[PDB]
Amino acid sequence: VESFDLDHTKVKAPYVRLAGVKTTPKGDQISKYDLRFLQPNQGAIDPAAIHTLEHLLAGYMRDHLEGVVDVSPMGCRTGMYMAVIGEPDEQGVMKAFEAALKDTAGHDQPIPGVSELECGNYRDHDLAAARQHARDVLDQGLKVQETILLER
């Protein structure tokens, strides 16, 4: 239940999807979300661009959603992973994500936290590509994706 056994060939990106839920000792819930930009195995986001997306979404997601633990790039680079403290709310998360993406598409100022002091690879960034990826998601249109499990 902490990480649904998703069949990646059956989803339709871009989308927002509850990926699992971990219950804490006191009974709180940590909801995990799959914020999918690209269709699995049909292409990937460039490393610099996803690095920039990581920087931008850390703040923009928090501007539109409470309880955010952190927003991380997925190793497969087709989307971002985000854990949130709270019961599952795919609809609410989708709306926050949509708003954060508009903020991202319109981000014409410098990328935050890009320096020797605040970033581990400050030379690896791409605002233009980051902005266009946000635009592409909004153009295509988000939806809440149901998890289709692997029969195994």
76 is in an annotated binding site: no
Contact present, 9 and 40 (Cβ < 8 Å): yes
Nearer of residues 123 and 152 to Zn ion, judged by Cβ: 123
Looking at beta carbons only, is 21 or 119 nearer to Zn ion?
A: 119
Dmax (CA) for the chain in angstroms is: 48
**Taking CB under 5 A as the criterion, which residues in 3-62 touch Zn ion?**
none
98 Cβ neighbours under 8 A, 6+ residues apart: 138, 142
Q: State in angstroms the smallest separation of the CB of 51 from Zn ion.
A: 6
Q: Which of residues 89-148 bind Zn ion (CB under 5 A)?
A: 119
Sign of CA dihedral 18, 15, 137, 37: positive
Q: How far apart are CB 99 and Zn ion at their closest, in Å?
A: 23
In the complex, what is the shortest distance from the CB of residue 52 to Zn ion, in angstroms, rounded to a whole number? 8
Q: Is 8 annotated as a binding residue?
A: no
Pick the closer one to Zn ion by CB: 13 or 53: 53
Q: How far apart are CA 70 and CA 54, in angstroms?
A: 9
Residue nearer to Zn ion on the CB measure, 88 or 113:
113
- The CA-to-CA distance between both ends of the chain, in Å, stands at 16
CB of 65 to Zn ion, least distance (A): 21
Q: Is position 119 annotated in a ligand binding site?
A: yes
How far out from the chain centre does Cα 62 lie? 12
CA angle 128, 17, 75 (to 5 degrees): 55
Residues within the annotated binding site? 51, 55, 119
Q: Which residues bind Zn ion (CB under 5 A)?
A: 119
